[PDB]
Design a protein around this ligand. Structure first.
Ligand SMILES: Clc1ccc(OCc2nnn[nH]2)cc1Cl
Ligand code: NA
Ligand SMILES: [Zn+2]
Length: 256
């Protein structure tokens, strides 16, 4: 599977029939229809003790991985019950600044989207968590092109060392707090992974406020390769799934 004409999102259902399921992601967020939920508790992003380890090009995106063997960096509150441990983050992005995000906001596409992936510690390990309807919480953050994001630059600068599929590099002492916007206002809904296996195991928390990154920063994302070393070059761009049918779901807002 991938993102090309011959193996992309319109093909995925043949090996992963849940691609046409009842709670697939991403979705369009219609801001006029999303409703404030006074019931949501405050969102708690607790990343002070986050321990990054490594950055990996897996042929689909690049992943920054964390030590999740203890409750270091966790996401709690909001729509969530219990404690979700940060395991990794990655992005999806476009070939052009007008596309690249997976979620859309009133059909608007952002240049990219950051996903911080967390798993529900009541299920003991990540593999067990993805088999549960409330196994994962993904914090989604839009990127728009404007001023540079200082906290992203250490990521940008290491991409030259993981150009191709299968390459990894040490990536210790990175603080993911530098990737967040000022506001934690969010939308939330029940959904799925946005790549195969497309499991319906995600509580989505999508921040309303985008972060700005510079044109130079996202240009360096676009120099990555889907291919492995020694293979014909396939630029890693447009690694996003389009919006899926909302079906029997309501998107809730944390804010008035
Ligand atoms: Cl660990 C991980 C890495 C990448 C990935 O991409 C698809 C995606 N993004 N947000 N939800 N699913 C999924 C996961 Cl669960
Ligand atoms: Na759920
Ligand atoms: Zn993602």
């Amino acid at each position: 599977w991938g993102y090309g004409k011959h193996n992309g999102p319109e093909h995925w259902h043949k090996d992963f029939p849940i691609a046409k399921g009842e709670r697939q992601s991403p979705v369009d967020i219609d801001t006029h229809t999303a409703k404030y939920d006074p019931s949501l508790k405050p969102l708690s992003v607790s990343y002070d003790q986050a321990t990054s380890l490594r950055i990996l090009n897996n042929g689909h995106a690049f992943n920054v991985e964390f030590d999740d063997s203890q409750d270091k960096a966790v996401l709690k509150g909001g729509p969530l019950d219990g404690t979700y441990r940060l395991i990794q983050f990655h992005f999806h992005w476009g070939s052009l600044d007008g596309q690249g995000s997976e979620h859309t906001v009133d059909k608007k596409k952002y240049a990219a989207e950051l996903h911080l992936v967390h798993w529900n510690t009541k299920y003991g390990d990540f593999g067990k968590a993805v088999q549960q309807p409330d196994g994962l919480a993904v914090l989604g953050i839009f990127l728009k092109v404007g001023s540079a994001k200082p906290g992203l630059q250490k990521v940008v600068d290491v991409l030259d060392s993981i150009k191709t599929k299968g390459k990894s590099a040490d990536f210790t002492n990175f603080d993911p707090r530098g990737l967040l916007p000022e506001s934690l206002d969010y939308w939330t809904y029940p959904g799925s992974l946005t790549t195969p296996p497309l499991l319906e195991c995600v509580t989505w928390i999508v921040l309303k406020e985008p972060i700005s990154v510079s044109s130079e920063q996202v240009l360096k994302f676009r120099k990555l390769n889907f291919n492995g070393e020694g293979e014909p070059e396939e630029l890693m761009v447009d690694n996003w799934r389009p919006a899926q049918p909302l079906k029997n779901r309501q998107i809730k807002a944390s804010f008035k």
